[PDB]
Amino acid sequence: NTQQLSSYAIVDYSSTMRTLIYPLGYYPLYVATIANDPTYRAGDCVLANFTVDFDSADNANASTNGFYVATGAASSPLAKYDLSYSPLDSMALDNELLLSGSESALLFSNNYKRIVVIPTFTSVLTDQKNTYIMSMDSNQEPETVDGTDRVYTLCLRAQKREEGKAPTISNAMDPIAVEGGTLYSMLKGKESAAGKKIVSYRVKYPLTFNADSTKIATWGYSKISQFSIEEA
Ligand SMILES: [Cl-]
Numbered sequence: 001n002t003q004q005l006s007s008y009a010i011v012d013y014s015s016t017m018r019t020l021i022y023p024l025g026y027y028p029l030y031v032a033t034i035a036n037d038p039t040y041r042a043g044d045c046v047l048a049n050f051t052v053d054f055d056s057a058d059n060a061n062a063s064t065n066g067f068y069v070a071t072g073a074a075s076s077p078l079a080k081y082d083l084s085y086s087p088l089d090s091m092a093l094d095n096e097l098l099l100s101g102s103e104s105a106l107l108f109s110n111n112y113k114r115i116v117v118i119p120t121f122t123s124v125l126t127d128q129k130n131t132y133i134m135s136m137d138s139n140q141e142p143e144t145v146d147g148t149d150r151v152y153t154l155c156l157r158a159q160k161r162e163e164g165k166a167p168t169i170s171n172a173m174d175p176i177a178v179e180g181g182t183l184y185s186m187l188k189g190k191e192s193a194a195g196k197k198i199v200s201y202r203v204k205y206p207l208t209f210n211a212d213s214t215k216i217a218t219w220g221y222s223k224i225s226q227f228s229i230e231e232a
Contacts, residue, residue: 003051007026009074010044012111029052031072043112044077046074078116087135095161096158096159097206101119103222113181115154117178119132129162136154151224154202154203155204188229
């Protein structure tokens with residue numbers, strides 16, 4: 001009868017100050033346990049697991065309420081980063097790490113926008129901690145990528161902050177949240193002026209170093225991610 005989903009989501013207030021979760025690809029949800037949990041605050045991103053009972057008395061007026069009542073739980077909030085408009089060169093950062101993936105999506109809520117990005121690593125140690133820099137060149141002209149026109153490129157780089165310990169974890173993922181509000185406003189302005197209804201972007205990341213690890217030699221790229229810039 002009921003089916004569980006897991007989706008990244010933003011915690012936020014509705015227009016009447018109810019705490020809801022706004023999952024990527026789903027409707028807004030009221031989860032009473034999350035709304036009363038001091039681990040969270042509006043603007044946080046989480047991985048939520050939830051179930052909606054479409055036949056409940058609480059969901060009889062969901063259309064007028066503007067949310068579904070759901071049960072579930074969520075992860076700890078994702079680490080938060082700014083989106084930097086200071087592009088970097090190929091020189092390696094201190095304690096820089098190579099990545100093996102960086103899929104992402106722009107999430108929307110009532111009051112916030114966040115890019116959720118999932119940097120992946122060939123290997124990490126248990127309890128390793130990283131910090132990140134998401135940057136881009138605001139003067140860049142978008143380009144055609146694999147048949148998609150006007151694709152913008154963001155860059156994700158990582159630095160090791162804590163070494164961690166054995167055992168080694170392969171193909172480790174470290175979901176993070178990046179501020180998306182000013183990126184959205186800027187790309188909406190550029191792409192609406194170009195007569196477009198969407199924005200297309202990808203995330204590049206370091207794939208290999210040069211021989212002495214002083215520079216990035218090659219880069220990897222995420223799949224293209226898109227979001228609408230049409231509003232009500
Ligand atoms: Cl967690």
